[PDB]
Swiss-Prot record, chains A, B, C, D, E, F:
Protein name: Capsid protein p24
Coiled coil: none
Region (Interaction with host PPIA/CYPA and NUP153): 42-79
Residue list for modification Phosphoserine: S1
Subunit-level organization: Homodimer; the homodimer further multimerizes as homohexamers or homopentamers. Interacts with host NUP98. Interacts with host PPIA/CYPA; this interaction stabilizes the capsid. Interacts with host NUP153. Interacts with host PDZD8; this interaction stabilizes the capsid. Interacts with host TRIM5; this interaction destabilizes the capsid. Interacts with host CPSF6. Interacts with host NONO; the interaction is the interaction is strong and promotes CGAS-mediated immunity.
Domain of life: Viruses
Residues of the full protein shown: 150 to 373 of 522
Subcellular location: Virion
Protein purpose: Forms the conical core that encapsulates the genomic RNA-nucleocapsid complex in the virion. Most core are conical, with only 7% tubular. The core is constituted by capsid protein hexamer subunits. The core is disassembled soon after virion entry. Host restriction factors such as TRIM5-alpha or TRIMCyp bind retroviral capsids and cause premature capsid disassembly, leading to blocks in reverse transcription. Capsid restriction by TRIM5 is one of the factors which restricts HIV-1 to the human species. Host PIN1 apparently facilitates the virion uncoating.
Lineage: Viruses, Riboviria, Pararnavirae, Artverviricota, Revtraviricetes
Organism: Human immunodeficiency virus type 2 subtype A (isolate ROD) (HIV-2)
């Protein structure tokens, strides 16, 4: 049902690929044809790193399944083929073929559960590699230009945007919170409720020759 | 088996609806008829908020299932009806009907797994809404009468009572720990091992006109 | 019904084998086959001392029953055997045999009530021997190493764990409350909200040669 | 597949029997014959406490299953026996018997899922009893000889050894970190990069009569 | 057997491709079909450098084998083909073909031992090229930004993570141990138990214009 | 050949179960019947810990082999039985049975190589658990009586005795080298070439009341 798919969606974004996602997937995918698992994969393919990890893990699972169950001789025409690894993945197998494999009296192959195990291993790998977050990890570098830091912070917040009013406060506070001190001082030197254009045009001298000369001059001033 | 039901019971109360309860339910409910899932629901219905959440989620799941599989024509008499949403819930379906649906050669409907998914979504919602605890969150308000705070703390501790000796120490320490300072000073003004009646009759003036006059008088005393 | 079994469970752990457990068992076990009494025993077998007491009492009851009703001659084949003591215990007798003994017109033997009396005597003995509790009785010895005391207190609290937040406060307060004074002084010498690793590494000198020398030196200091 | 077994292996050692292991086992064991569950048990039997817990829990599960489904009459020869509790455990049942029970048209018994529930309860008990760790919990006692503490720390680190270079640093730092102060002072009295033989021969006087006399003498020195 | 595969796994990670791995592989691979050797390769393919080395060595071995034993004429249909280099590798040959080659009376070709020699040469090359380790070799560069050094140290420790408590101590000590002095001084300037966010925001000025001016100013201060 | 057995003997004692012993065993055991492997085991059974480890590992290997290849029906009389796990171990199988299994045209079972893998896993476990040595690790404890330390050092040196003249020097030097300082001072207080009886009768007061009084008296002497 689409409501279960929405529940898995909110699990995927609300919970950033924690240890609970593997048992959650095993719970949601019970009694699901590989077609339905593909529809589930459609929504979770948004995360590019997780998407490529699950793609490669499914590819290797399918390759080894084909190695274990190859075709040394063509099947007689008019009969359903044995499920290949890609058939388990659901790409080369239609929903009717999968349901026939489920319901065939002669040695049914639970390809749905096999694909569930494949995606379970993929989600395991994703969890083992997935970093905690990125919005709080956006930290300006001492050599990094401030404009690039602002741009990447904006991209990070837009990737998980919350509310137009909330993101204004995000840009108001977290941008200066993660800013390096040389930019931070000119950021705090103006005052309350900064706006993007004026703060950009005011901070666009940090590290430049004028500010280099100013900082060395003042440093010599307390030296002398 | 009743021992598995007891294991799920201790999971329910020992673990206050954490992220593990959803995979735990999916694990325990495997190979279980909706009748057995109803018996499991009987013990977990104690938590009123979780009970109503799972009730409403099961109701909406059953309603949408009936929408997907309605009855536009009466079934011929003497044959088992198609499983309705309430039949999946097990309320309108007996255990024999569910086991026949499990074991019928002609297109069995895994209603047990469908009800498992329903209760899984319900437990997901419960976890997403469930607050951490209440015994440590019982905190007296500045305007809240102390007797009402004591009564609600007693109810909170009785809801999860531990040991007659332990709860005596609970009332001895946590009651004054969470007490507001005006009541806290009269609570600490007596001494070791307070008892309920005397502490109640001693604290039953906090905020009253006598204590108002006393506090304003002493405040003026250090003012003057 | 499993709900009555859960009620007896909460009676068993909430009430630490008080005088009420014997009449409670007699009340719950009314109209119950020895099979159901065995299922009840399954949950109450958690308490090891009570488990062994009821095991030995049931063994001696069954032995004396076999003495009173032995088999000096084999029964003709195809007929239900007379209920042995183990048959009353339900280990060697199936539920169908017990229900046949209940419902046989020719001199039914109420083996269910006999096993109820057996477990009643066992619970009587358990109550007569059972100590009040253990969590408050965990008291450090003057010679006992503090690490062993902490370990056994942790085991005692884990045996009847209440809440992750509550047990933090348990370790915060009761550990120093039951600590012997030489360890207690170094425990209180740091301050608010101790954590396990630092308190362990700070208290891991009590009774050691350094603290022996320190205490004798200071004692001589007030002596001199 | 052996790769799934390796994934469960890394789950078992990397995650020290957390709350996730129960849903993880339920996920991996789906669609697995009790033979495969026995092969999984082969790798997880390394943990002795967990091994004995799962052994006893499986034994009691099998005993109660045999009580529920005993054999009051021998089966006719040439036919597959009904699955006993040990048959569910897979010890007395071959893989062909289990797959026949899975695929028999006449009332198949999902013994695989029953054994999964058994091992799930066992893992639940293991998690409920399993202590956090041991490498950081190796703490010298005030009376414990330093050589025994070193030996047990070496055994603890060897049980979960990481890297030959890392364990050198482990012995360099954690040994003195968890050492009691009387041994700690002689440990720190030499300097940088200690080696095992010299530190052992230098610390092999702590608590001895010479160090007793030295400490009491110095204590009297600041007393006088 | 999967237990031997697990033994080889623990050999692979516990022993970082030492001189013992070649004889160990020769010992484990005795009496093993190339199919089993492929399953062994599945677990050891985790090490990317070793994986590519063994891939290229197997490819060149197979190419030279095909050169020595080419096919200048198609085999008659219905008969098993002569084992190619890829057939020895097991990719293009099924387990039944390999076992037939093992058991064929007419000049059996020990392709299993040939593939064992191939992987033996690959492991030899891996050992000859494999660096000792990386966790202790993570050393900050004088120009390297501290955040990148922290990130790569975190990746290195996560690649061989040991315990959640142990890695906290790893980040606490080894990060400052391998830190360059300019970052090291601000790292040590705060005190005990640093946490990641505050240490990152405090060290995010090292090498920046403010710290440049500060260091040159103080240097001139002792110069003057 | 017995000379190869002697070579493996000198490998076993000269090399204290290093990483080389596993490939060495795999090298020596090639082309060896389980009978010959049993004769090899006869000499290596001297090491009690290694002996019990290999015994238990062989027992579990044989048990799992019997699980994989059980006997659900008696073999016709006059024919060689299929090799059981104990038959692979060689205890229940004679040399003629093993050589027939080697040389039987119909599906020979390489039981020799299987037992080689079993003992290889056992030697792996032994190496992973085996401590470096014991003769240099014999270190007196601060509370350990000196006579017991001498006795255990004598047992350790006798377990690996070298030469009558060498062991005299061992007792002359290493006994005082590993001795705790309180015993060490009386050991060095006599002079050159001590003999066992006089050193024993001279050191048999360390820790006793006379030496306690002497050490405290002298300590007070430098205190006063």
């Amino acid at each position: 049902s689409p409501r279960t798919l929405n529940a898995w969606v909110k699990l995927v974004e609300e919970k950033k690929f924690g240890a609970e996602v593997v048992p959650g997937f095993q719970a949601l995918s019970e009694g699901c044809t590989p077609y339905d698992i593909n529809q589930m994969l459609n929504c979770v393919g948004d995360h590019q790193a997780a998407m490529q990890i699950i793609r490669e893990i499914i590819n290797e699972e399918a390759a080894e399944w084909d190695v274990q169950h190859p075709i040394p001789g063509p099947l007689p025409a008019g009969q359903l083929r044995e499920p290949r690894g890609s058939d388990i993945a659901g790409t080369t197998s239609t929903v009717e073929e999968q349901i026939q494999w489920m319901f065939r009296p002669q040695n049914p192959v639970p390809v749905g559960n096999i694909y569930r195990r494949w995606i379970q291993i993929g989600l395991q790998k994703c969890v083992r590699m997935y970093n905690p977050t990125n919005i709080l990890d956006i930290k300006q570098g001492p050599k990094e230009p401030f404009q690039s830091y602002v741009d990447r912070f904006y991209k990070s917040l837009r990737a998980e945007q919350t509310d137009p009013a909330v993101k204004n406060w995000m840009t108001q506070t977290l941008l200066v919170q993660n800013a390096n001190p040389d930019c931070k001082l000119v950021l705090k030197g103006l005052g309350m409720n900064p706006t993007l254009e004026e703060m950009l045009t005011a901070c666009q001298g940090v590290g430049g020759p004028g500010q280099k000369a100013r900082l060395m001059a003042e440093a010599l001033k307390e030296v002398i």
